[PDB]
Structures are given as C-alpha cells and as structure tokens.
C-alpha cells in the first residue's frame, strides 16, 4: 500500500537495537553467543512485526518463517556490524573478535572466514543502510501468495534506491543480483550454522508463539 | 568471452547443454542415483568448459567451483526436467518417482518436498529454456566464489542476458527486475537442499582434477 521511500523510513524505524555482550574455551564462547543471540532474538521479533506484511499473515505462518530464518537474520545483522572492522567480528560493542580466537570452538573456524568474506563483499560493494534493511526484509519471507507480492514491492524499493543513487539501468539490475545472490551464501552459513548447534546437547517456537501471540 | 552479446550467450549456453542420461536397465534406489548422478558428473565437467569465462580461470579454482556447486547443478537439472510432472521428480525417464515411491528413499525425506515445491515454483513463473541455462551457469561461478574480479564480470554479463529474455518476452522493466529476484531468490532453496543432501551423503577434489585434465 505504501511508497518507495516510507518503505525504507518503515524498516529504518523498525531496526532493532546493538545489544552489548555479557582467554576463552570452548564452552564459554558459546555461552557467550547463545546468550547474546537469545536476547537479540526478543527483539528480532518485534523487529519481524513490524515488516510490512507480516502481521497480516497467520500465526502459524509468522512462527514458520522466523523459526527457519532466525539464524540467517542474525548472520546478516553480525556482518553489517562487522564492515568497518576488516579481519574481525563485531559481535557486540564490546565482544569483537579476529579470526584467531574463533579457533576456541572446532568447526567453526570455517563458519568465521565465510562471515568475514561476506563483510569484505558488503564492503567491497559499499553496501547501504537502505540495501541492508531491505535485504533483511526479503531474508524474513524468502526463506519460509501475499508474501511474494510484499517480495515484489522490495524489489522495486531496491531498485528506487539505486534509480536515485543516479544508476543506470544496467548497473541496478546487475547490483540488485549481486545483493540477492549473497543471500545463497548466507544460507549457507546458516546451514552449517545450524549443524553445530545440532553437534551439541540439549523452546524457540515457544519463545516465538509467546511473543507473537 | 566478456565482448559477447546476450543471444550469444544464451546459443554457447544451449549448445553447451548436457544430454538427459538414463538410469541401468536391469529388470531383475541410493545405488541407482549414485550411478546416474557419477555418469552425469562427467558430463558436467565438459559443459563447464563450454560456460563463457569459466576456462578463463586456473585448474585450481575451476575444480573448487564445481565441487562447491555440482549438487546444486543435478538438482536444478532434476528439477527442470521434472516441471511437466507435478507432483512428480523425473531423475531419469525411466526413473519417475512421485511423493510416496519417495518418501521411502535414503534421506530423500526432507528434499523430495522441496525439489516438488521448486518444480512446482518454476512451472507457474513458466521458466523458459534460456532462462534456465542462465541460471545453471550462475550457480557454477556463485556456488563457491566467497570459499574473482572476472567472475562477478562474467555473472554481471549473465545478469544483462537474463533481463534481455524478459525484454524481449514483452515484459514491462518493473516485470523484468521482479523476475529477476524471483528466479535469484529461488536459488537460496537450490542451496538449501543441495546443502541437506551433503549431510546425508557425507554419512571430490580430486576427480574433478582428473576430468579437467582433458
Ligand atoms: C556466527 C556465530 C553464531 C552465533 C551468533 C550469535 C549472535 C549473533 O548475533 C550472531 C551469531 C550463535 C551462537 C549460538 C546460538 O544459539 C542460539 C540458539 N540456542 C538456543 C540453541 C545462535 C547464534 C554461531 C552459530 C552457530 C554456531 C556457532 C556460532
Ligand atoms: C535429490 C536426489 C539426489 C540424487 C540425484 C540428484 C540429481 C541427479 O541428476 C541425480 C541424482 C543423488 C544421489 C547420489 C549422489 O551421489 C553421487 C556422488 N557419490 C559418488 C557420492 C548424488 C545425487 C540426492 C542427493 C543426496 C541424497 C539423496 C539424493
């Protein structure tokens, strides 16, 4: 329903907040990240609600989409923090770590090198504040009709903030399928994301209903 | 290779196609699916050499490339040749194996569904031929290029043959860049299933290196 630019002034409003952190092990890295991702996770779903059209869809379908794209969604937001600090993670203002200490926990020394190689390509493509919501947007309902519609729209608010940017009409679509083909790539770390934490012992859907609903 | 136009690109892509093989005749399912999916591997390595700019990169990153992306490459492949087959994969013509012939197969429990649904996806947006050998070839050069200032060349030429399809089709320019990012954003599944099917199968650089050496 809405216009180009009060799309991007609707999800820049909607930016959720840099959350701060709590030699390490294996066992308190993680309790570090899993900690830090549980309370970003509160606010990623207030984020999600107010994604133009996502409150329009039904529970069911809402819980769906974040339970499959969480991981995804916070990948993303780690890498935009992190493209000012070349050869580091920027976790949290006050947890920002190279590609040395990532070695406390086994596997996921290749996981890091994928997240700071997707920096460097933010960086290398000088990515916008602009893009990177709306990037963020498209990650919430590709990765679970009327969504494809509100897909559309994103597409052609990406597509207005290049036009403006003085791009022709080669450039637009050709950055528009760099934007969209780094997503693959962030699927993938997703997935090898999810692999470790499945590699380890033992609630999201529960946290995701409560808060929903 | 970077000079080419976009229906010449579009014709060195489908001349560079690869045949439908089929599946071992013996009347007296994993095994059948390794044997065709190692016979088609081959066939893979010369269509490779035949994408634009891609023999324009070393040994080295060309076998990284294909090792990153083969599974993604027969997947779509698997899912274009069944798209007349709804509710239907079609691994070979002799091989077509619905949803419950599938459900009872090794691991094919989660991506059955999936390669379903994106078959299903790719018959309603009516995803032409050309279209669909622009998209193999984006996967070959995307798959493996963040695990190189020639390869995004070469995707961003692929990106302008894409949009000429659509241009051509009769397609308005808001049409042409919605198709655009609903084929690209497509590819995210491709990725997503081929990376639940190396799970699976993990229950290599070196082949590639020998079939390049031709
Ligand atoms: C890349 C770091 C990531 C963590 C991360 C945390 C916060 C953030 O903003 C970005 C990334 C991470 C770590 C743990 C985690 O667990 C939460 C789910 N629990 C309840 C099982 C999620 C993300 C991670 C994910 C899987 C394995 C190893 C690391
Ligand atoms: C979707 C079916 C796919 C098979 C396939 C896909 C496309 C195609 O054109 C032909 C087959 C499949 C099965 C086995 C396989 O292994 C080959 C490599 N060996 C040497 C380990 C590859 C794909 C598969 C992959 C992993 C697990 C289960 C199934």
């Given at each position: 329903?809405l216009?180009?630019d009060q799309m991007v002034s609707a999800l820049l409003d909607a930016?959720?907040?840099?959350?701060?952190?709590?030699?390490?092990?294996?066992?308190?890295?993680?309790?570090?990240?899993?900690?830090?991702?549980?309370?970003?996770?509160?606010?990623?779903?207030?984020?999600?609600?107010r994604v133009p059209?996502?409150?329009?869809?039904?529970?069911?379908?809402?819980?769906?989409?974040?339970?499959?794209?969480?991981?995804?969604?916070?990948?993303?937001?780690?890498?935009?923090?992190?493209?000012?600090?070349?050869?580091?993670?920027?976790?949290?203002?006050?947890?920002?770590?190279?590609?040395?200490?990532?070695?406390?926990?086994?596997?996921?020394?290749?996981?890091?090198?994928?997240?700071?190689?997707?920096?460097?390509?933010?960086?290398?493509?000088?990515?916008?504040?602009?893009?990177?919501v709306?990037?963020?947007?498209?990650?919430?309902?590709?990765?679970?009709?009327?969504?494809?519609?509100?897909?559309?729209?994103?597409?052609?608010?990406?597509?207005?903030?290049?036009?403006?940017?003085?791009?022709?009409?080669?450039?637009?679509?050709?950055?528009?399928?760099?934007?969209?083909?780094?997503?693959?790539?962030?699927?993938?770390?997703?997935?090898?994301?999810?692999?470790?934490?499945?590699?380890?012992?033992?609630?999201?859907?529960?946290?995701?209903?409560?808060?929903?609903?």
């Amino acid at each position: 329903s809405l216009t180009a630019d009060q799309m991007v002034s609707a999800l820049l409003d909607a930016e959720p907040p840099i959350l701060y952190s709590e030699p390490f092990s294996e066992a308190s890295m993680m309790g570090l990240l899993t900690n830090l991702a549980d309370r970003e996770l509160v606010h990623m779903i207030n984020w999600a609600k107010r994604v133009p059209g996502f409150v329009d869809l039904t529970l069911h379908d809402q819980v769906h989409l974040l339970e499959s794209a969480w991981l995804e969604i916070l990948m993303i937001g780690l890498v935009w923090r992190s493209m000012e600090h070349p050869g580091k993670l920027l976790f949290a203002p006050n947890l920002l770590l190279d590609r040395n200490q990532g070695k406390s926990v086994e596997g996921m020394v290749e996981i890091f090198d994928m997240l700071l190689a997707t920096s460097s390509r933010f960086r290398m493509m000088n990515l916008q504040g602009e893009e990177f919501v709306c990037l963020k947007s498209i990650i919430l309902l590709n990765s679970g009709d009327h969504i494809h519609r509100v897909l559309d729209k994103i597409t052609d608010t990406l597509i207005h903030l290049m036009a403006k940017a003085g791009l022709t009409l080669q450039q637009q679509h050709q950055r528009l399928a760099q934007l969209l083909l780094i997503l693959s790539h962030i699927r993938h770390m997703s997935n090898k994301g999810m692999e470790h934490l499945y590699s380890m012992k033992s609630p999201l859907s529960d946290l995701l209903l409560e808060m929903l609903d």
